[PDB]
Design a protein around this nucleic acid. Structure first.
Ligand SMILES: [Mg+2]
Ligand SMILES: [Mg+2]
Ligand SMILES: [Mg+2]
Ligand SMILES: [Mg+2]
Ligand SMILES: [Zn+2]
Lengths: 158, 99, 139, 56, 144, 114
RNA sequence: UUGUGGUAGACGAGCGUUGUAUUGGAGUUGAAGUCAAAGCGUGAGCAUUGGUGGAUCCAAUACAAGUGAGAAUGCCGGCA
RNA sequence: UUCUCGCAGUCAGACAGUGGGGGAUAAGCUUCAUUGUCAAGAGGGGAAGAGCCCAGAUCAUUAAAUAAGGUCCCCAAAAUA
RNA sequence: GCGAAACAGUACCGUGAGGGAAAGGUGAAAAGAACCCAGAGAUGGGAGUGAAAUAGAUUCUGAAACCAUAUGCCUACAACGUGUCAGAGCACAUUAAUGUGUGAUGGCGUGCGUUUUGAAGUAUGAGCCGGCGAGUUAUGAUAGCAAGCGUUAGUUAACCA
């Protein structure tokens, strides 16, 4: 701002008798040395609030629309295994299931490690535990694979 | 030969085979319009209007006149309002005039 | 067929060079070299050399006729300037600005040589309207 | 005394109309060929058929 | 929009005239002269083409001013100096310079304009009956 | 986030300058003068778009007065002879143009004599 | 049908800019920027073609702002 | 034009007609009550005028009838008695 | 943006404390332009390398003010806030349009912001161009609009993962 600039508090010209502007200080907002008058500050909060029950309503409705959209194929723990740490087999699964250009989202309860070892080098896709899916992260999916277990959890959470 | 005809709100001195521009008439290109009002067809002067006399014209085109960009500006009193206008017109020519 | 010759940042004014450049323009070359040598100006010793160099460039390089030459078009455009301070009474320090001039002389061979520039001008708009028309086929 | 209003690019150009230069009279020295300005001695050092100077 | 009004342009044809200003008065003559010069009476008067006719006024000194004006109304002319008022009277204008009287009385009736100074030169006010403008073959009409 | 935006200012000033071409001296160069002159020109346009229909009617009156003065009556008497007798809505221009194609106008000026 | 002058001033609807997000897509067969042109809009403003230039960018919906200059005897640079 | 709620702005006014004070039935003076206008309002008349008279501009038309004022020329428009 | 993208707290001002700047980009790579002509020489014009030398060491792009050249039109009796509405003649030919550039001649016409009862103003600000530059932010109050949740309702803060 006007004050933090290494600057001169000396008055550059006398107030009168020299025919020029008044111009109190060298580092003013309209000088080119530059005291940015308002500017952006590092303390802006940038935070919004949403009542928890409203958030449960939003999550519930987004699940309702996404889970009846002829892409939410339900998955079992088996193919979380039977896919080695290699991603080639996962790419074959995606290609056979006509899910290449989509952005498929895996949701899991027990967080298997063979799966997330794959799909990490894939920029499209991503695997998340149930407690880590957000409204944006879910309505962005455009195709998702729910595991058969989490339904029992999900029905409890509404 | 000549005739005087009231098309729109302007009275026109019109001969055979002359093209003149009148205000919009709501009629598509190529059709024949019979302008109804008429006065002083040929040495025959209708006082109010010349009854049972028409002039038959073929409409040539619908166009927009040159843009008139009107800006009005109170002097030294905080006002610079601007507005533009393109008056539509129809150009049409006569074929022959009903006696 | 122009064969120009340019000298940049000559230490002369643009507005003093334009006075003799007016003398030389439009006249034939035989009555330009001598008429420019004989005039008593600083702006003449600086243009006689340049004009003779233009003569030599035209004759050697492009291969024109010579005695058909004439000085097509002469200017003295503004070259870069120099800024300096000058003392004054009571210390007020005005700024002297030294001038300069980017002289250039063009020597044409055919007497017209002007309708050809107009021809290029007209072609540069003919191709614009033509490209405009060929892009009216968007149906 | 100062100008009250800047003299535009029009008034200035008109004033300089009388500034144009004159083409000085030129003669051709006999006894050699060259265009000496008239009523002088050319660089021959010859003025007419009389010698008044050195070679150049 | 509408048919554009017709307006002649450099289609001018001008016929001379003659009026013998024997016993007319100044102003009533002057308005008629001014209109004849401007071509105000033409059936097709274009306001910017000098569509008016020429005019020659004869026997200027015989024109008359009504009332006692001949001794009471003055014509003034000032140079740009000081004390330059030249003040003459109607009796002295009807004797010394009569053509200048009709000339001035006509010129003032024209608009402050750029053809006015080109219109006024179409008025030739000879002081006496004889003239050298018989070559132009004027017509002749009374009181205009 | 910082925004400079030199594109928009130049485009706007370019439109204002392009409006005033064929203006004397610097009026087509400097923008500050060009805007003043464009504003003033549009004021004059607004005033003249009314003054010209104020004046053309006057011109038609004048060129009708001249035509009638060579038949034996004045314009101020002709208008009666259109309204009250032989009620006619012939316009105030066309009765003017009819002189430029005359001898069809004389039919008018003798028709109202009834 | 009744209206539509208007400073201070209240209210409404809007254009443009910079970037982020997802969605489409154009680009060395020449991107933005820059000039020129005899276009289109009710306005802020928006296209089309060509020369130059030599790599990024346009539209749709939201979002966030160092967001919109003719004036401050304004600041800096240039030029009269 | 009454009531409630949000949001202001304003508190240097001027002139013409009318009735009076101060003033000297002086002021384009000053201070009031009233009717308008200007401010914050263009066009026409007034030769030219912020405040007078007529009027109250959405934009275009090279259409017609009018208000105040006005009709020898400038300047559009008239004659008779 | 740090005052500072580079040899910046330098150069510079001041006796001294102290004050205190500006400016970067060839091309992918020097293949930095051997040689020839003019010239004293810088340099310029050809050549040559290279995709381009309108990339040439003035080195990315290269507006405007500004200064010069030129086709086309007008202007040397003319009172001019410099334009507008009409309008001739002249010369061309388009983002195909009742077209474009100039514009003899008629009518008409006392700039922009500011502050003022009122300014063309003999009141003030601006020489011109370009860029920079002025109602934001944190935390709370009330009001309007929208949304979630609801009649023993609603709602989290700090903190922890
Ligand atoms: Mg002054
Ligand atoms: Mg001189
Ligand atoms: Mg402003
Ligand atoms: Mg002063
Ligand atoms: Zn000799």
């Amino acid at each position: 701002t006007k004050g933090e600039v290494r600057g001169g508090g000396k008055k550059p010209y006398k107030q009168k008798h020299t025919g020029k502007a008044r111009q109190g200080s060298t580092r003013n907002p309209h000088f080119v040395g530059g005291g940015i008058v308002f500017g952006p500050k590092p303390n802006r909060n940038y935070s919004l609030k949403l009542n928890k029950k409203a958030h449960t309503a939003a999550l519930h409705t987004v699940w309702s629309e996404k889970l009846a959209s002829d892409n939410t194929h339900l998955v079992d723990q088996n193919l979380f295994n039977k896919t080695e740490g290699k991603t080639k087999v996962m790419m074959q699964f995606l290609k056979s299931a006509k899910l290449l250009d989509k952005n498929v989202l895996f949701v899991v309860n027990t967080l298997n490690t063979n799966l997330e070892q794959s799909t990490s080098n894939i920029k499209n896709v991503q695997v998340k535990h149930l407690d880590k899916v957000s409204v944006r992260d879910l309505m962005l999916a455009n195709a998702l694979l729910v595991e058969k277990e989490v339904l029992k959890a999900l029905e409890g959470k509404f | 030969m000549h005739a005087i005809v009231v098309c729109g709100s302007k009275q026109y001195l019109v001969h055979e085979n002359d093209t003149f521009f009148v205000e919009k008439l709501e009629a598509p290109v190529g059709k024949e319009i019979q302008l109804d009002k008429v006065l002083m067809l040929d040495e025959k002067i209708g006082a109010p209007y010349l009854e049972k006399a028409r002039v038959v014209c073929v409409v040539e085109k619908h166009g927009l006149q040159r843009k008139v960009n009107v800006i009005k500006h109170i002097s030294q009193k905080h006002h610079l309002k601007k507005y533009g206008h393109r008056q539509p017109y129809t150009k049409l020519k006569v074929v022959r005039f009903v006696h | 067929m122009i064969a120009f010759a340019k000298q940049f940042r000559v230490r002369i004014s643009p507005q003093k060079a334009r006075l003799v450049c007016q003398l030389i323009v439009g006249k034939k070359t035989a009555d330009a070299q001598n008429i420019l040598s004989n005039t008593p100006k600083k702006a003449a010793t600086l243009i006689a050399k340049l004009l003779n160099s233009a003569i030599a460039n035209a004759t050697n390089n492009h291969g024109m006729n010579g005695d058909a030459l004439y000085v097509f078009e002469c200017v003295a455009n503004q070259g870069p300037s120099m800024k300096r301070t000058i003392p004054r009474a009571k210390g007020s320090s005005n700024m002297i600005t030294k001038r300069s001039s980017n002289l250039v002389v063009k020597l044409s061979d055919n007497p017209n040589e002007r309708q050809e520039l107009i021809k290029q001008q007209k072609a540069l708009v003919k191709k614009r309207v033509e490209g405009q028309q060929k892009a009216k086929m968007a149906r | 005394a100062v100008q009250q209003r800047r003299s535009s690019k029009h008034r200035r150009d008109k004033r300089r109309s009388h500034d144009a230069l004159t083409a000085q009279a030129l003669s051709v020295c006999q006894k050699c060929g060259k265009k000496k300005l008239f009523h002088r001695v050319c660089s021959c050092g010859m003025y007419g058929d009389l010698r008044v100077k050195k070679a150049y | 929009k509408t048919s554009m009004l017709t307006k002649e342009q450099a289609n001018k044809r001008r016929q001379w005239y003659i009026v013998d200003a024997a016993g007319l008065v100044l102003g009533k003559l002057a308005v008629k002269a001014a209109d004849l010069i401007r071509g105000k009476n033409k059936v097709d008067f274009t306001p910017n083409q000098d569509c008016g006719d020429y005019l020659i006024i004869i026997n200027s000194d015989q024109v008359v001013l009504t009332g006692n004006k001949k001794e009471n109304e003055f014509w003034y002319h000032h140079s740009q100096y000081i004390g330059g008022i030249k003040k003459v009277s109607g009796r002295d204008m009807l004797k010394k310079q009569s053509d200048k009287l009709v000339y001035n009385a006509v010129k003032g009736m024209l608009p402050d304009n750029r053809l006015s100074r080109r219109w006024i030169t179409k008025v030739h006010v000879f002081k006496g009956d004889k003239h050298n403008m018989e070559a132009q073959k004027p017509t002749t009409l009374n009181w205009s | 986030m910082r925004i400079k935006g030199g594109k928009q200012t130049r485009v706007r000033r370019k439109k204002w300058l392009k409006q005033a071409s064929g203006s004397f001296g610097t009026r087509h160069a400097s923008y500050k003068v060009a805007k003043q002159t464009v504003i003033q020109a549009a004021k004059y346009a607004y005033r003249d778009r009314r003054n010209k229909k104020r004046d053309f009617r006057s011109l038609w009156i004048l060129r009708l007065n001249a035509a009638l003065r060579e038949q034996g009556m004045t314009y101020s008497v002709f208008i009666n002879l259109l309204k009250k007798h032989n009620i006619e809505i012939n316009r105030k221009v066309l009765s003017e143009l009819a002189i430029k194609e005359p001898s069809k106008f004389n039919l008018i000026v003798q028709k109202v004599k009834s």
